[PDB]
């Protein structure tokens, strides 16, 4: 009937130029496929901090936010989908019908539980990208994919 | 003995938030290794226009701009360097000493001449990225690679 694309991400307070771009893609998604952002609190890093405990804590909050959604992690070693392939996946997610949680890890990455829960995993790049740009890249690529499905003018290059 | 990184891009309109992001990274490159933008005016797609001819004209100009430089194309089918490899490429480019021209194609992509002129081709993603994001990604990823080489904090933030 409609499928929410929900970005579940660690971190807060992105640079304005980033927040602006991200918002520009976000507001162009149609009402029958809304794109939304859920931010998970980043664990307090520091000296003598237990990284592993923090990752686990972040993961548990992310899994709580995904609920019974399709879970797709953004991970460098995931599937290197090209744009036609992503359009196909979006169609797949539509047929599935469950809202989609797209998980983006914090500074230290995704918890093992999050990687285990993934139904699919998606690689944007072989590069190590900074979290804010990952947010913008997910918004645009999915928008482009959406447009291909609806024969919208943005994708015709 | 500084080495120049010249982004040779088919001239395009950049949204303000993209322009801000792009300059933010660009501004942080050392005098040791300058990051530079050189736009090539995009041809107009008139009625009945022969696309192939339009493209060649775009390319010839790119190559004229590249000159004697090492020519690296940004192309989806190119080498999907990870961030470690990109730092290693950066080191190779320095040993060369020769300036690098990094080519970004117009709406129709790179001219066959540009693709042929390439000593190396570099893929950011399997995805079809919009021209302005390609600029920001190149600036940030090259910055991250450089950061590694000098043990600058950015890479290890
Ligand atoms: N190439 C990529 N493809 C898909 N997801 C990515 C990619 N790079 C980073 N991510 C996501 O971004 C998250 C990690 C980023 N916060 C990495 C920044 C980290 N602080 C560092 O210094 O590089 C990872 O958990 C992934 O979920
Ligand atoms: N994933 C990528 N990796 C490297 N360069 C890219 C990538 N995506 C886009 N570009 C650059 O952006 C330019 C314009 C592209 N939108 C052209 C699209 C491409 N001709 C296609 O149909 O998939 C291309 O000529 C490339 O130089």
Author numbering:
A (entry chain D), B (entry chain C): -1 to 155
Sentences from the paper on this structure:
RlmH acts on the assembled 70S ribosome. RlmH consists of five parallel β-strands (β2-β1-β4-β3-β5) sandwiched between two layers of α-helices: α2 and α4 on the solvent side, and α1, α5 and α3 on the dimerization interface. Our data suggest that E. coli RlmH functions as a dimer, with the SAM binding pocket of one monomer and the C-terminal residues of its counterpart forming a composite active site.
To gain insight into the mechanism of RlmH, we determined 2.3 and 2.1 Å X-ray structures of E. coli RlmH with the cofactor SAM and with the SAM-mimicking inhibitor sinefungin. The crystal structures of E. coli RlmH bound to the cofactor SAM or to the inhibitor sinefungin contain two dimers of RlmH in an asymmetric unit, with two cofactors bound to each RlmH dimer. Because the two cofactors adopt similar conformations, we focus our discussion on the structure bound to SAM.
